[PDB]
């Protein structure tokens, strides 16, 4: 039987230390495998409730370089035919289409515009049920997809859970990414959470050379094409990271992220692609924005207060959050970088009994002991960071507590969001300092390996967490495993 959080924190563990190569545009998996207006990059996303889901896809090739001419999204329809059997696609839904462009008004830089992106919401679905579907435009010969299938989340209730939820972040599109995704797919998750930093298109110049701020947007299309075997069969929920900012003409940001994925923004009443909520069985998930105003006077905070007040913990016992930047990572990389977000939101989330937090951003794996306001606390959330999806940026290997590695405080805050909130500790072992001189006691486990996690919620009190390292391929391999046990009578 696996160990558990029920008997308190564990003594910290650091796994001793042991670039990825981006997939080339010659890889058949990233090339166009369809012609004309046939769908590609097909992806399923959850709605706010299990009884609805989104199907999205792109029709038409992108344009890169020269005098790009954005496509008219009204010229290709957005239709999904679906049903309970592969030969019985008797239900129909329609949606809307859009394009986005990536434009730079500087000599020598190249412009991009997308294929036509489609988003269709299916309503009136049975929970826990396999649906077969085709997408495309039935009025254009050859413009319908093959038949695909996905399974809706189980019905919302305290003993009803998806079997496995995969959690990844900072995938990029390297050969190590393919290892992460293959490991994940072999675990047959019912749901994928992607905690920001998707394609790493901004590691390229517009002319395709791999390193104002620039991107090579075709990496998004390569990513979407590579991921389609997963996303067309498995719902995937994405939240933005800093690599999605992709600032362009007129200060426009997040164009690719906001256009490409479906989010339950309207259904969960966030009306933002950057944060939203949804239920999957008895789990209420909140995806938060580390890169949209998170201050107590802002819209995201107001939405979050409203969202939390509606959660009934007898219906959804589990309250789980995801966002890009960790609050309790002990690596030097991005150490205390999101402190202002923690200071803004942590007390609100603690007051509502947040159970688990998943993040990315730090290119390594870390699991915290239960913690609130830098204090080990039996009612604090477990913070797990899985930004180790395999992108081409350097792995995080140095720890802030390593001798001589404590960063200068003023160098740590996120420059995009601004502010400084990371003051020296005033109590505990590290009182008077910015960092510890050994692994902090709120850090249970940290390892500089690529991998993915699987969450298996069992009932209203127990969830089994497993993290799998990419370099282990044998059956049943697991790097870190623990039962996360909640105590609602104690903490709520
Ligand atoms: C919610 O799910 C958890 C996890 O499945 C339940 O706890 C688990 O309950 C089973 C059955 O009582 C325990 O199995 C027993 O484990 C011992 C070894 O520890 C073994 O010798 C027995 O033959 C038997 O297999 C299991 O240990 C226990 N696991 C943990 C971490 O507590 C829990 O009871 C469920 N709660 C509700 C309200 O349903
Ligand atoms: C890219 O688009 C911007 C805005 O329309 C324009 O200023 C620029 O000239 C374009 N660059 C090229 C090579 O077409
Ligand atoms: C990334 O993949 C390469 C090639 O398979 C492998 O040699 C390397 O060890 C992987 N890197 C990590 C940190 O696992
Ligand atoms: C892309 O632009 C950079 C910076 O000017 C340049 O160094 C590089 O050689 C260019 N790559 C190509 C394929 O033109
Ligand atoms: C772009 O951002 C700067 C501030 O960073 C601002 O001065 C400027 O007015 C903005 N331009 C537009 C079109 O919003
Ligand atoms: C967190 O700890 C600091 C210093 O002890 C304290 O000033 C602050 O009020 C605490 N924040 C809470 C309880 O939300
Ligand atoms: C905070 O701690 C660092 C060492 O981590 C130290 O250099 C610095 O002087 C401290 N700042 C204050 C105001 O105490
Ligand atoms: Fe990041």
UniProtKB/TrEMBL annotation:
The keyword Protease does not apply. Residues 164-365 form the Calcineurin-like phosphoesterase domain. Residues 39-152 form the Purple acid phosphatase N-terminal domain. CDD domains: MPP_PAPs. It comes from Triticum aestivum. This is Purple acid phosphatase. Its EC number is 3.1.3.2. It comes from the Eukaryota.
